Amino acid sequence: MQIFVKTLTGKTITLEVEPSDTIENVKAKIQDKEGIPPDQQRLIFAGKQLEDGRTLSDYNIQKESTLHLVLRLRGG
Amino acid sequence: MQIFVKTLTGKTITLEVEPSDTIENVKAKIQDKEGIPPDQQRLIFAGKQLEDGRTLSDYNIQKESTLHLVLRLRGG
Known part of the structure; x- marks a missing residue:
């Protein structure tokens, strides 16, 4: 499925994910x-x-x- | 989520916090x-x-x- 990620500058990016994806996995997609x-x-x-x-x-x-x-x- | 807090006497207490909870708010919870x-x-x-x-x-x-x-x- 496709979900969208909104940044504080108003930018929208897209990811293809699955329900089983953990949050760290999604953070790893955003990193790559x-x-x-x-x-x-x-x-x-x-x-x-x-x-x-x-x-x-x-x-x-x-x-x-x-x-x-x-x-x-x-x-820190 | 659940976190654990360890003291210098080896005692473990637990709290129910949010990732966005500030350290100031965790101390207040311990005060509670x-x-x-x-x-x-x-x-x-x-x-x-x-x-x-x-x-x-x-x-x-x-x-x-x-x-x-x-x-x-x-x-102080």
Whole structure:
């Protein structure tokens, strides 16, 4: 299925994923596709930050669901 | 998600947090559970002493991760 990722600049990117994909997998797609390491990605769906070890199906993410990508430096 | 907190006496407590919860909010939760003021709490993950203004996700604190709690009096 196809889901969209919205950035804070208003850009929209697309991914082909499956319900079984974990959030870290989706962050890995964004890394290969856009060059951002997962350490710097935060994914938000329905106002909730998504947990790496859970799947897209755990969050009821369906086809043409829109996630929000937020870029973040890691903790110091 | 569930996190674990380890003290200097080997005791393990647990909390139900969100990836976006700030370290300030985790200390308040420990205050809810143990009555210890946040001022007296130092939270540590991977040897790093965490910053109250960062989120758990900024430190790669995830499902069933174990933080360490050290108690210290304020400066203050």
